[PDB]
Design an enzyme around this catalytic site. Structure first.
Site, short mmCIF file in Angstrom:
data_model
loop_
_atom_site.label_atom_id
_atom_site.label_comp_id
_atom_site.label_asym_id
_atom_site.label_seq_id
_atom_site.Cartn_x
_atom_site.Cartn_y
_atom_site.Cartn_z
N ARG A 76 0.82 -1.08 0.05
CA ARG A 76 0.10 0.06 0.34
C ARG A 76 0.95 1.42 0.02
NH1 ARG A 76 -1.29 1.74 4.94
NH2 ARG A 76 -1.05 -0.14 5.84
N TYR A 224 -2.00 -4.13 -5.75
CA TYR A 224 -1.41 -4.72 -4.26
C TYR A 224 -2.34 -4.36 -3.17
CZ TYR A 224 1.81 -6.73 -1.02
OH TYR A 224 2.34 -7.47 0.00
N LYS A 233 -9.04 -1.04 3.11
CA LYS A 233 -8.74 0.32 3.97
C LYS A 233 -9.54 1.42 3.41
CE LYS A 233 -5.81 -0.73 6.67
NZ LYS A 233 -4.98 -1.83 7.30
N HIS A 253 -9.28 1.23 13.12
CA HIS A 253 -8.12 0.29 12.97
C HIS A 253 -8.11 -0.59 14.06
CE1 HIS A 253 -3.75 -0.27 11.34
NE2 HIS A 253 -4.50 -1.18 10.84
N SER A 275 0.31 -0.82 11.92
CA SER A 275 0.63 -2.18 11.63
C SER A 275 2.05 -2.33 11.99
CB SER A 275 0.50 -2.03 9.90
OG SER A 275 1.81 -1.38 9.49
N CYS A 277 3.05 -3.62 14.58
CA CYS A 277 2.95 -3.66 16.16
C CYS A 277 2.03 -4.48 16.93
CB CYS A 277 2.61 -2.14 16.41
SG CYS A 277 3.63 -1.00 15.95
N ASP A 300 -8.05 -6.30 12.34
CA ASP A 300 -7.91 -5.15 11.82
C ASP A 300 -8.71 -4.16 11.69
OD1 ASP A 300 -5.45 -3.88 10.13
OD2 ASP A 300 -6.92 -3.90 8.39
N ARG A 394 2.60 -11.44 2.36
CA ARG A 394 1.12 -11.68 3.06
C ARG A 394 0.78 -13.04 2.80
NH1 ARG A 394 -0.87 -6.82 5.70
NH2 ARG A 394 0.87 -5.29 5.23
N1 LIG Z 1 8.42 -8.53 20.99
C1 LIG Z 1 7.04 -8.62 20.62
N2 LIG Z 1 6.76 -8.75 19.16
C2 LIG Z 1 5.55 -9.00 18.82
C3 LIG Z 1 4.39 -8.94 19.77
N3 LIG Z 1 3.37 -9.10 19.05
C4 LIG Z 1 3.72 -9.30 17.85
N4 LIG Z 1 5.00 -8.90 17.54
C5 LIG Z 1 5.91 -8.90 16.25
O1 LIG Z 1 5.41 -7.88 15.64
C6 LIG Z 1 5.56 -8.04 14.32
C7 LIG Z 1 4.14 -7.68 13.91
O2 LIG Z 1 3.21 -8.58 14.12
P1 LIG Z 1 1.79 -8.42 13.85
O3 LIG Z 1 0.82 -9.48 14.21
O4 LIG Z 1 1.81 -8.62 12.12
O5 LIG Z 1 1.14 -6.96 13.67
P2 LIG Z 1 0.12 -6.18 12.88
O6 LIG Z 1 0.55 -5.67 11.55
O7 LIG Z 1 -0.35 -5.10 13.86
O8 LIG Z 1 -1.16 -7.03 12.56
C8 LIG Z 1 5.69 -9.59 13.85
O9 LIG Z 1 7.09 -9.89 13.67
C9 LIG Z 1 5.36 -10.28 15.46
O10 LIG Z 1 6.47 -11.39 15.85
C10 LIG Z 1 4.96 -9.01 21.34
O11 LIG Z 1 4.04 -9.11 22.07
N5 LIG Z 1 6.18 -8.71 21.59
MN LIG Z 2 -2.12 -7.50 10.99
MN LIG Z 3 -4.04 -2.61 9.39
#
Ligand SMILES: Nc1nc2c(ncn2[C@@H]2O[C@H](COP(=O)(O)OP(=O)(O)O)[C@@H](O)[C@H]2O)c(=O)[nH]1
Ligand SMILES: [Mn+2]
Ligand SMILES: [Mn+2]
Ligand code: NA
EC number: 4.1.1.32
Length: 604
Positions: A76, A224, A233, A253, A275, A277, A300, A394
């Protein structure tokens, strides 16, 4: 009519007919395929993409697929994403001194030029697919219908997973309102530029536009994710947030999860993190604490509305998960690992020689014999310079296959939210967890959100920075106004930080399933338990309030350490940010919360 290869124009509701035929006259597709959403349509379209080298089948798994893109079209793109309104101020606040980072406005005049320079004849030689789709459960009074026209089979397939798509949608629509969604890869035939990796895209001309006043989303040049899968989104955050502002509801979000304690008592919580996080990870957490159960409603996007009784009701308007693959391992997200092994479309991950998938952080050995093809279609070994998967690669997977999908994930009335969580990555100064002092404080906490870019600490209010459908000052006023509904049961608001690091860059909190220890304290707090201690930033857990058994070296003093120096710096940054970025549209209550935090910190 002559060019319809599936379905019937005569059959469409009149307004849907006008949209299709109007844009057929414009785009000049060779055929028009009105999607019915059937398994037969899906499988035939998949096999077709396969024949053509657009996708490959992953033989290690059941009905799974891998697409590899033009490396120019891999994410995106915010710099190409615009919202058109008569007045700039309705789209973004006019910033005091700087350029706005809360949206990107484009005049109607400029957009019309850009449009006329892109869309005429753009689908020449291609099929226009008509995708009738429902964001949200089919019956739900919170659901909204869209129609997406696209010339990408990869978009039709992915939309079948990420939305509810097909004939039943058209029959439910009748003569009702719908969001007009137009997409083209922007590569009419004969091809004028070389086609890269069988992935049609037009990077120089990419433009993802939203025209809320016309209920239109118009997107060009990218195949994409968020640029092309217009329900996600573009519809469910940008168009919807504004619709929600007009209509009295919220488009956020946010993940939605159901949490159950060892007594069987259950609550629903929503959470907004930027994202990368960790939302997807939290939304399908495997809790380490015995007796505890997390179930996933969405990972999401949340649409929420107070009902007649004052419960905040949340539906997940998506029908699937569009998750970042790299970092996904049995250790970190075993439930995502489980979900994605059937009926799933992968994009820009590596392929193993036995027809499986691979990515950095998968944290799982390959058998002696098994080699790796990178997302760039080249042979790959753990000591090449390049990652085997693109960092933004993805999985696109059906929600209904998640083994912990919540039993009310499709209930038309939505799930009652009792807590809303904010958070991001902060290596320093922000405790593991705190709770807002009040609704107005909680709105301030959302507004103040900051997160390490994935060394810069960026502002990302409500995790919505890339998604506001309208003026963020007005969006704050809209959130504050919720307290003024007589019946409203305002959920408790919390802020979390999984990512505080110690002096040598090491994480202080192990995170993942251990986050269930933080959820427990939240749950207790919603029930009214005396487990909180007041600090200048809000309530934090009391000493001994958190279950920390089985952890080992957890430095609690450093973890919940609230420094005066840090927080003085933090309020200045928030102050400057809100002043510049929201300026004249900043609600009084927010400035007031900012004043109050500054004052509580000054008394330390
Ligand atoms: N250190 C740590 N890393 C995390 C935690 N939760 C997710 N991550 C990492 O953050 C990155 C993004 O996770 P994701 O589930 O894809 O986040 P999203 O994009 O907000 O859905 C991944 O590499 C995870 O391994 C956590 O509780 N602690
Ligand atoms: Mn996600
Ligand atoms: Mn998102
Ligand atoms: Na390809």
């Amino acid at each position: 009519s002559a060019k319809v290869i599936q379905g019937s124009l005569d059959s469409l509701p009149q307004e849907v007919r006008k949209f299709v035929e109007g844009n057929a006259q414009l785009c000049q597709p060779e055929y028009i395929h009105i999607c019915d959403g059937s398994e037969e349509e899906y499988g035939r379209l998949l096999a077709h993409m396969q024949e053509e080298g657009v996708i490959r089948k992953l033989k290690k798994y059941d009905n799974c697929w891998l697409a590899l893109t033009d490396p120019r079209d891999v994410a995106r793109i915010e710099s190409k994403t615009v919202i058109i309104t008569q007045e700039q101020r309705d789209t973004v606040p006019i910033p005091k001194s700087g350029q706005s980072q809360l949206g990107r406005w484009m005049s109607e005049e400029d957009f019309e030029k850009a449009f006329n320079a892109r869309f005429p004849g753009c689908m020449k030689g291609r099929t226009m697919y008509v995708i009738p789709f429902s964001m949200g459960p089919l019956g739900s009074p919170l659901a909204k219908i869209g129609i997406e026209l696209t010339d990408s089979p990869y978009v039709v397939a992915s939309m079948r997973i990420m939305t509810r798509m097909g004939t039943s949608v058209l029959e439910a629509l009748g003569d009702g309102e719908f969001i007009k969604c137009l997409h083209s890869v922007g590569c009419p035939l004969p091809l004028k530029k070389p086609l890269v990796n069988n992935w049609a895209c037009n990077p120089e001309l990419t433009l993802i536009a939203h025209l809320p006043d016309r209920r239109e989303i118009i997107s060009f040049g990218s195949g994409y994710g968020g640029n092309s899968l217009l329900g996600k989104k573009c519809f469910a955050l940008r168009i919807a947030s504004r619709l929600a502002k007009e209509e009295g509801w919220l488009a956020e979000h946010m993940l939605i999860l159901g949490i159950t304690n060892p007594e069987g008592k259950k609550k629903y919580l929503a959470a907004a993190f930027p994202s990368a996080c960790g939302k997807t990870n939290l939304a399908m957490m495997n809790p380490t604490l015995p007796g505890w159960k997390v179930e996933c409603v969405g990972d999401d996007i949340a649409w929420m509305k107070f009902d007649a009784q004052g419960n905040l009701r949340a539906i997940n308007p998506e029908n699937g998960f569009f998750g970042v693959a790299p970092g996904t391992s049995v250790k970190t997200n075993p439930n995502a690992i489980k979900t994605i092994q059937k009926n799933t479309i992968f994009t820009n991950v590596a392929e193993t020689s036995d027809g499986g998938v691979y990515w950095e952080g998968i944290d799982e050995p390959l058998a002696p014999g098994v080699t790796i093809t990178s997302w760039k279609n080249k042979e790959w070994r753990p000591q090449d310079e390049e990652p085997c998967a693109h960092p933004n690669s993805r999985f696109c997977t059906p929600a209904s296959q998640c083994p912990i999908i919540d039993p009310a994930w499709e209930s038309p009335e939505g799930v009652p939210i009792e807590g809303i969580i904010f958070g991001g990555r902060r290596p320093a100064g922000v405790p593991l967890v705190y709770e807002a002092l009040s609704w107005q404080h909680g709105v301030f906490v959302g507004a103040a959100m900051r997160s390490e870019a994935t060394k810069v600490i960026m502002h990302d209010p409500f995790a919505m920075r890339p998604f506001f459908g309208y003026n963020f000052g007005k969006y704050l006023a809209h959130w504050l106004s919720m307290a003024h509904r007589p019946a409203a049961k305002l959920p408790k608001i919390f802020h979390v930080n999984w990512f505080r690091k110690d002096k040598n860059g090491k994480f202080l909190w192990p995170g993942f399933g251990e986050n269930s220890r933080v959820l427990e304290w939240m749950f207790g707090r919603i029930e009214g338990e005396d487990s909180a201690k007041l600090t200048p930033i809000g309530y934090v857990p009391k000493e001994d309030a958190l279950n920390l058994k089985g952890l080992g070296d957890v430095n609690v003093e450093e973890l919940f350490g609230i420094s005066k120096e840090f927080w003085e710096k933090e309020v200045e940054e928030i102050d400057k940010y809100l002043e510049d970025q929201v300026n004249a549209d900043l609600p009084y209550e927010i400035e007031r919360e900012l004043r109050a935090l500054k004052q509580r910190i000054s008394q330390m």
